[PDB]
UniProtKB/Swiss-Prot annotation:
This is Angiogenin. Its EC number is 3.1.27.-. Changing residue 101 to I: In ALS9; uncertain significance. The gene is ANG. Changing residue 78 to D: Slightly increased ribonuclease activity.
Amino acid sequence: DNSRYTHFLTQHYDAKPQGRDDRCENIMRRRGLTSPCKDINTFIHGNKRSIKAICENKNGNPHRENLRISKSSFQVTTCKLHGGSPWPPCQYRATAGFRNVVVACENGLPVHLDQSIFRR
């Protein structure tokens, strides 16, 4: 089941932000992360092939505990729940970012994004 890679794209890939401000509150609803309100979530932007390539040496190095780390940097956006309360309406602060990413590959497909690096 590639459903884990599928759930990855759904939680972490947005090919082109439209604009990356707080108005997070949308893509988090459009993506089904608001019951309960997902506390932090990051979208990678840009072309897929590139994010996919983190899955070999062509853009990836082993990291921590069997997680890969990208060699290149990606435009990224981090949505942080604001207000502390777990229930919609979900209000989010956006943070654009540009840096490399940490992921988990399984049979060469992304299936996880390590969110800790954006929690800062």
